[PDB]
Amino acid sequence: EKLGKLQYSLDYDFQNNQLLVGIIQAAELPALDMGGTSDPFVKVFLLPDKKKKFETKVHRKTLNPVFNEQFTFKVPYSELGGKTLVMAVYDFDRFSKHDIIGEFKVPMNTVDFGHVTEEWRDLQSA
Amino acid sequence: EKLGKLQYSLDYDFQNNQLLVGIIQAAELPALDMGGTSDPFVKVFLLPDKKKKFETKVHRKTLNPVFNEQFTFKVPYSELGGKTLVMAVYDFDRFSKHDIIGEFKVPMNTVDFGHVTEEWRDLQSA
Ligand SMILES: [Ca+2]
Ligand SMILES: [Ca+2]
Ligand SMILES: [Ca+2]
């Protein structure tokens, strides 16, 4: 499926014991409204604790939103390896339930915290 | 002069009386002669108050840094007019002899605070 792509970054604040998730921008998203646009936003959380969650601002009438946001998760470094970061992109609708675009998951045990990288990943269906 | 370009956003937080400056990324920063890259960072401040200032993190060995930062200036909305935002991109030096790459200035009087946009602007010579 061609659902667009998301650019994000991961870092760990070793001084305050927090995971830092940069949600930078998305590109080439599907148009889920009339007239060729969507109103995208991203939900961000860590599995298995769907507790502590964030979402970006809703960007209106764009398939290439520049979020420029950063989220902070208080999670002990020794426990981070067992977590999976979920970034799920939706189309905000006022007059109906929000339309799923797609998502990407990052198992935290795959992450190198030695240097921050910006990563593009293609969105997937759940 | 082919100095590259900077993507930024401006907004005003009307509930907390703060100017919001997004420093998203830069692109196509000029390649030095011998050493092929730069270590870019951006200084951000509001003229005529040079004292309240911010800087991005330093990004190592890149001509296309993705800063993904947001800065806030406590300034009354009624005082914005006549002020100018400066965004100046430097090549970091360990010993604080930083080299300006280029800059540009946004007079508040040119900004429409009714709608938030991300804008790319070409860097200009000091
Ligand atoms: Ca829709
Ligand atoms: Ca919509
Ligand atoms: Ca809907």
Swiss-Prot record, chains A, B:
Residues holding Ca(2+) 2: 32-33, 91, 93, 99
Amino acids binding Ca(2+) 3: 93, 96-97, 99
Superkingdom of source: Eukaryota
Residues binding Ca(2+) 1: 33, 39, 91-93
Tissues showing expression: Expressed in melanocytes.
Compartments (UniProt record): Cytoplasmic vesicle, Secretory vesicle membrane; Cytoplasmic vesicle, Secretory vesicle, Synaptic vesicle membrane; Cytoplasmic vesicle, Secretory vesicle, Chromaffin granule membrane; Cytoplasm
Quaternary structure and partners: Homotetramer. Heterodimer; heterodimerizes with SYT2 in presence of calcium. Interacts with SCAMP5. Interacts with STON2. Forms a complex with SV2B, syntaxin 1 and SNAP25. Interacts with SV2A, SV2B and SV2C. Interacts with RIMS1. Interacts with PRRT2. Interacts with DNAJC5 in a phosphorylation-dependent manner. Interacts (via N-terminus) with RAB3A. Interacts with SYT12. Interacts with calmodulin. Interacts with DNM1 (via C-terminal proline-rich domain (PRD)); this interaction facilitates vesicle fission during clathrin-mediated endocytosis (CME).
Annotated domain remarks: The first C2 domain mediates Ca(2+)-dependent phospholipid binding.
Role, per record: Calcium sensor that participates in triggering neurotransmitter release at the synapse. May have a regulatory role in the membrane interactions during trafficking of synaptic vesicles at the active zone of the synapse. It binds acidic phospholipids with a specificity that requires the presence of both an acidic head group and a diacyl backbone. A Ca(2+)-dependent interaction between synaptotagmin and putative receptors for activated protein kinase C has also been reported. It can bind to at least three additional proteins in a Ca(2+)-independent manner; these are neurexins, syntaxin and AP2.
Family: Belongs to the synaptotagmin family.
Disease: Baker-Gordon syndrome: An autosomal dominant neurodevelopmental disorder characterized by infantile hypotonia, congenital ophthalmic abnormalities, involuntary and hyperkinetic movements, stereotypic behavior, poor or absent speech, EEG abnormalities, and global developmental delay varying in severity from moderate to profound. Behavioral characteristics include sleep disturbance and episodic agitation.
Name under which the protein is recorded: Synaptotagmin-1
Originating organism: Homo sapiens
Gene that encodes the chain: SYT1
